[PDB]
Amino acid sequence: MESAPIVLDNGTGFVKVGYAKDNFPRFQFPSIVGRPILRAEEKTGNVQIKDVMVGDEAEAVRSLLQVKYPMENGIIRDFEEMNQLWDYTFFEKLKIDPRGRKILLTEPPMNPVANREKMCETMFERYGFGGVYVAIQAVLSLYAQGLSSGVVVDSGDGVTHIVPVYESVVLNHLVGRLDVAGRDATRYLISLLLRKGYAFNRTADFETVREMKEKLCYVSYDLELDHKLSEETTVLMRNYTLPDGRVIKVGSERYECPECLFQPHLVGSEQPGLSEFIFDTIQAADVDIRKYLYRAIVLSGGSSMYAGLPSRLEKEIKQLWFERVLHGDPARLPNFKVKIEDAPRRRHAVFIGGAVLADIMAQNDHMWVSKAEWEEYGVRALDKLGP
Amino acid sequence: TFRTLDVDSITEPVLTEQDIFPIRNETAEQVQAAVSQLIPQARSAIQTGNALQGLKTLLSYVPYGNDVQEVRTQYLNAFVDVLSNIRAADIPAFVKECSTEEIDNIVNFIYRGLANPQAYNSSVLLNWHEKVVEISGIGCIVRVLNSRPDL
Amino acid sequence: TALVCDNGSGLVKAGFAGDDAPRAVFPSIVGRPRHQGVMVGMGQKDSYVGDEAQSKRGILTLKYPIEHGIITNWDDMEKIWHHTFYNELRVAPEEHPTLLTEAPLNPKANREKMTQIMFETFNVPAMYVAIQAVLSLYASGRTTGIVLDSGDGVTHNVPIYEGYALPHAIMRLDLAGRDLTDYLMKILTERGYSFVTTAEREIVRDIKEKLCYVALDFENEMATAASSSSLEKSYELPDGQVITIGNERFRCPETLFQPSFIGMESAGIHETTYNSIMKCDIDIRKDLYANNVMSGGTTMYPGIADRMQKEITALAPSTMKIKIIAPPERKYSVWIGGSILASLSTFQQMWITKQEYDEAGPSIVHRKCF
Amino acid sequence: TALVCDNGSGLVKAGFAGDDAPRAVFPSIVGRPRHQGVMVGMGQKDSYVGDEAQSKRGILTLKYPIEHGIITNWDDMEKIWHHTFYNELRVAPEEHPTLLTEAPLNPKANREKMTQIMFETFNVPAMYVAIQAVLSLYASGRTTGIVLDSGDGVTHNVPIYEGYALPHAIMRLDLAGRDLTDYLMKILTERGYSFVTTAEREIVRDIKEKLCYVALDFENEMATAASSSSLEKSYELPDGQVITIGNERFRCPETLFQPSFIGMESAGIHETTYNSIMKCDIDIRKDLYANNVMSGGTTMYPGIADRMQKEITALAPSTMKIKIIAPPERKYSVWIGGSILASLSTFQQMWITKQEYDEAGPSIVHRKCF
Numbered sequence A: 001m002e003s004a005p006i007v008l009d010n011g012t013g014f015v016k017v018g019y020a021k022d023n024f025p026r027f028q029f030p031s032i033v034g035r036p037i038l039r040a041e042e043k044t045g046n047v048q049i050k051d052v053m054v055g056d057e058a059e060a061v062r063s064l065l066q067v068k069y070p071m072e073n074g075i076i077r078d079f080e081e082m083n084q085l086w087d088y089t090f091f092e093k094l095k096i097d098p099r100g101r102k103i104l105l106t107e108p109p110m111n112p113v114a115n116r117e118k119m120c121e122t123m124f125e126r127y128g129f130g131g132v133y134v135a136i137q138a139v140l141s142l143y144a145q146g147l148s149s150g151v152v153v154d155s156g157d158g159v160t161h162i163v164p165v166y167e168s169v170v171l172n173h174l175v176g177r178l179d180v181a182g183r184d185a186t187r188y189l190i191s192l193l194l195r196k197g198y199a200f201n202r203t204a205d206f207e208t209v210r211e212m213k214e215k216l217c218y219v220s221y222d223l224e225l226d227h228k229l230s231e232e233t234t235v236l237m238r239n240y241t242l243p244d245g246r247v248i249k250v251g252s253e254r255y256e257c258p259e260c261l262f263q264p265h266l267v268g269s270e271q272p273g274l275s276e277f278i279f280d281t282i283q284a285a286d287v288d289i290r291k292y293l294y295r296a297i298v299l300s301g302g303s304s305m306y307a308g309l310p311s312r313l314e315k316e317i318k319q320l321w322f323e324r325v326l327h328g329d330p331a332r333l334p335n336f337k338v339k340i341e342d343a344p345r346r347r348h349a350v351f352i353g354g355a356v357l358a359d360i361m362a363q364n365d366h367m368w369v370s371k372a373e374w375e376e377y378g379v380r381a382l383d384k385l386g387p
Numbered sequence B: 001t002f003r004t005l006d007v008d009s010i011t012e013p014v015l016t017e018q019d020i021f022p023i024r025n026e027t028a029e030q031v032q033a034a035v036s037q038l039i040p041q042a043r044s045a046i047q048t049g050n051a052l053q054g055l056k057t058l059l060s061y062v063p064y065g066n067d068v069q070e071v072r073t074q075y076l077n078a079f080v081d082v083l084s085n086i087r088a089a090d091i092p093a094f095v096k097e098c099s100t101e102e103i104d105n106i107v108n109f110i111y112r113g114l115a116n117p118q119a120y121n122s123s124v125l126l127n128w129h130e131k132v133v134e135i136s137g138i139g140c141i142v143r144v145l146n147s148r149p150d151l
Numbered sequence C, D: 001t002a003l004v005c006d007n008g009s010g011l012v013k014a015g016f017a018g019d020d021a022p023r024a025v026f027p028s029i030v031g032r033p034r035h036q037g038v039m040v041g042m043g044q045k046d047s048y049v050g051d052e053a054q055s056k057r058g059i060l061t062l063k064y065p066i067e068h069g070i071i072t073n074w075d076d077m078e079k080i081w082h083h084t085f086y087n088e089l090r091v092a093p094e095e096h097p098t099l100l101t102e103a104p105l106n107p108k109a110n111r112e113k114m115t116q117i118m119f120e121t122f123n124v125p126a127m128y129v130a131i132q133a134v135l136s137l138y139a140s141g142r143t144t145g146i147v148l149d150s151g152d153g154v155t156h157n158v159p160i161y162e163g164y165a166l167p168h169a170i171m172r173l174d175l176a177g178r179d180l181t182d183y184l185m186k187i188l189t190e191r192g193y194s195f196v197t198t199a200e201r202e203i204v205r206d207i208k209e210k211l212c213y214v215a216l217d218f219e220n221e222m223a224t225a226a227s228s229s230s231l232e233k234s235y236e237l238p239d240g241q242v243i244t245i246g247n248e249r250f251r252c253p254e255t256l257f258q259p260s261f262i263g264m265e266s267a268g269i270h271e272t273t274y275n276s277i278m279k280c281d282i283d284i285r286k287d288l289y290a291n292n293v294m295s296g297g298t299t300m301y302p303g304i305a306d307r308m309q310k311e312i313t314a315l316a317p318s319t320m321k322i323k324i325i326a327p328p329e330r331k332y333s334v335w336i337g338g339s340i341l342a343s344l345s346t347f348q349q350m351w352i353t354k355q356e357y358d359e360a361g362p363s364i365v366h367r368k369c370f
């Protein structure tokens, strides 16, 4: 294929993988590992299950598997299962020998140091990569825009994180985590459907409500209007057929599920939701740069894909500036400019930006942490990878 | 809390009805005089027993506008009074000789009549509705759905 | 051709002799990046200068390399000099004789090092380095008068009679637009507006340049502000927020007339003009009350000339006529006077130059630059 | 008895004049329930304050009605004052005159609304609103000193000599224990610990009070922490879960000397104190170096006085005798100083009475109070 640097978005819900200059993931698959189970469920001779089965091999066959996730909240929870994802990623998805290759990895901005350390150790000491770079996921989503300033908010399966950038300087003191994302919204959909008498407690059923959420949920633009369509009308009602063949009815849960991003208290969090987390972040930036951050609020990651989320977010920031800056005086509201950037490709902006950055540093061999540098400095070799 | 503050009403002004429907090219006192010339003809045609010619003359002009409810309701009083005085056997012969624009005006003003039963006799307006829709078809109601809101 | 600049304490202005205005004018600033984290595939400078630093400022620490008219960061002055020559005027300095400036009563080493680096680092054939007030008597058709200058970092009074300077009567005051910006930064905290960052100094300097004035009668203006909102005005911050300003818009400039507002135990702006006239000789003083010119950007306030008029009229004997002179080119008149001096028909022999500097060193400058 | 109430930005301190400690000391917090699910008639209410807000905190959202020394919520600050009077001190405030405290360089509207609520809602006989740092001087038995006060929301330097304050030389920094607790909640994420609720903020404040310290030399403590677990300590969470903390113990307080750790463009407290004494006149600069009074709970760290001494002696000239005055009661020194001041004979004529408030309105506080 090519001698290029490999780029790997080892995300909490999905792995995405490919090479420098790729305009889209070469492969993308669930970051899941499966073990064989029997469960008072259908069985046939038309398949065979190995003692470890992962990614697409697990997701297509998950009725037969104990499904587990090697990651949660942007951190590796189990490196023994993460080793099985990385084996699968290199040896039977890419079908590559890692020996002496250079690889670009990704993580969110406020992880434990042990996550990056043991992840780089694994690249040098299981796979024998010749060099590694680890990039902050949301600065890659800005490389995908071809853009040097704006506040970039990335919401995936594990974490929602925000990174203000101005004139290519990253405002590291302003970066933050909202510990609500696509998995919390999926756990909330299970909780809301449980009030309707449905049950989804099997490890294989989490991917079923993920696909249901991803098909049927949307962000209410106006809560009292969606509550009116919900309580006065049947128009929000929708049928979903599970891979069982069972049919379930879903109504208010379609707007009530993703509302936990804009109202985290619905999932028990005390943090402010997306609009107020983004506003408190921009409003903490210096006076001379606030306008440039409001004129480029860059959305990223799969949990930014709910229908109406850009519309609600733009409105709710105008509405929050009107409360907290103008104190309810209409006369200056038309002068406040905000622009949500909401590209079609934005679920993959971290990969697409990693494929840009990995090309920009492909020839600059000193930019990567080397295997020869790792084996003499250990974890102190990673002090190259920013502050 | 911020969620309830209407920003859209001031940051993105929506289309008005006069952006969809063209402005009336006549002043309020100019249309009020034009109707005040017609109502006496419409009343007089009842006394001579020519209520069919009473409608044909009254229907030659129609008032519209949110600034003219008093003369619109006076025109509707005359319209329902004229329709109440035409014999039910004359309706089929009269409807087939109306233009598409006269029919559109009849089915519009029987609709304004049906909206206010404490003022207007619905029984004659429903009899007119049956015969106008039977002879001229469904499209005359479709033209009322699509019609101007200040008729 | 000859190249002239006011190497200003807050605003560099530069051009060629015989032009009617400076072609370059920019903040006397070097900026450096304030945060360690960057998009590693993108280029940043190590440091920035002038309008580029001023527009980049949201991510920069801004340093003025001059404070109170004294070069304080020589390593940064070499950058603002290099910026005047190679970015703004786009010259070859090795071909052009140069005119620089400084305030009176300055450190002797300031005149030396700005002589030294112009020859040893910018290779110039020649230079001169004049008193800013002595230049500012030119650009008015004049040989007698008292000149009051207030730049960014220095205020000074210089009496001249018939082309002779009187250094017994010359005096310098360590108040100008820098201290007035600091005091505005302080007294806006009283409204609850917080300005702290080196970048926020600049938006406070812009408020000071746009909103402020000198009150003719401060106690009555202060009572006018206390009784009425009718003298309050608004400023728009670079994020789009609106700031209302009232009595603080005249309390700031009045610090020239009352230095005690910044805790300075020193005579006011009118008192230093009167004390320097009163320190002149007994006959040559007799038209200085009638021949007093204002220069430098801190003298641009509305009302300052009409205040100066009534204050020196209250101090001086009423037996003779009292005026003030305040050109609309006030903030350039130092440079206009340099443009005139560097094009004057007797001046082409006057420069310090390599043929003498190569053996005398920078110790040559005190021998003919005053 | 007069009352003395220290309006602490994180910790209210209240008592009677002539007593030698606060009678009550408690969090400046109002807490509201974050759940609508309830028990009927069960002693259950719309808000909790002080020690009820701390003891119930897991089910509350906690907010301080003061941020950076400024009252941001007046409806909840009146609940805190109501609680000081009717629940903690157990007095009717209309019987007792009250000394209040304020930070320097606050919004004037803060001190106006603070006198207005005290007369218009608490009906007090008389009141006064002293700057905190002069009270901390009077608590220490001296009339010369430079007072470094550091509370929850503000840290400030006031130079004072022979009982005269030098208001042009005052420094204020919007960095204290709130910002250190924020930065500790931030850097504990690197150990893998997530603290994000307003209740977990109070757990991390307790980690900070129990285990954090000022490094005598920071880069040597960093090299020590990289070499050994001898620097590491363990903390018992309210869960019974055990937390381990290492270089975060001294990286947290290092922010007070290096504000750029939180992206803030400022001098650290050494440089702020140095620039404050260096802004005073040269005869007073001889003496305040021997009288650096430390005050408030953010000056309470282990190792802070020795490192404040080793830093300030590197900035000052080598001939100077430097002393850091850091009493074990320094947490309460502004209150102890208010207890002294409200007990003085000559102070009783300089209260603001309810009569002169009715005659002048809330703007009287600017002519009565420094």
Ligand SMILES: Nc1ncnc2c1ncn2[C@@H]1O[C@H](COP(=O)(O)OP(=O)(O)OP(=O)(O)O)[C@@H](O)[C@H]1O
Pocket: A010, A011, A012, A013, A014, A015, A073, A074, A155, A156, A157, A158, A159, A160, A181, A182, A183, A186, A210, A211, A213, A214, A215, A217, A300, A301, A302, A303, A304, A305, A306, A307, A347
């Ligand atoms: N159209 C959609 N509507 C709603 N949710 C969506 C949509 N598309 C994707 N998602 C959700 O986004 C999540 C996956 O997004 P993404 O790949 O960006 O996460 P990740 O990168 O693996 O996670 P993280 O960045 O936190 O480590 C899943 O919860 C998925 O169901």
Ligand SMILES: Nc1ncnc2c1ncn2[C@@H]1O[C@H](COP(=O)(O)OP(=O)(O)O)[C@@H](O)[C@H]1O
Pocket: C006, C007, C008, C009, C010, C011, C012, C028, C150, C151, C152, C153, C176, C177, C178, C205, C208, C209, C210, C295, C296, C297, C298, C299, C300, C301, C302, C331, C332
């Ligand atoms: N319109 C104005 N009104 C008041 N101050 C002004 C005005 N325009 C500029 N300034 C002040 O001018 C000062 C600079 O004066 P300037 O002559 O340029 O000094 P310098 O050349 O020596 O650096 C600045 O501090 C600025 O605040």
Ligand SMILES: Nc1ncnc2c1ncn2[C@@H]1O[C@H](COP(=O)(O)OP(=O)(O)O)[C@@H](O)[C@H]1O
Pocket: D006, D007, D008, D009, D010, D011, D012, D028, D150, D151, D152, D153, D154, D176, D177, D178, D205, D208, D209, D210, D295, D296, D297, D298, D300, D301, D302, D331
């Ligand atoms: N021993 C200590 N070591 C470090 N910090 C302390 C200590 N004791 C209290 N603090 C800090 O003191 C701050 C409160 O100080 P205080 O003087 O009462 O402030 P304030 O008056 O403004 O409310 C809190 O942020 C707390 O974390």
Ligand SMILES: [Mg+2]
Pocket: A011, A012, A137, A155, A156, A157, A301, A350
């Ligand atoms: Mg992701």
Ligand SMILES: [Mg+2]
Pocket: C006, C007, C008, C009, C011, C151, C152, C296, C334
């Ligand atoms: Mg100048």
Ligand SMILES: [Mg+2]
Pocket: D007, D008, D009, D010, D150, D151, D152, D296
């Ligand atoms: Mg305090």
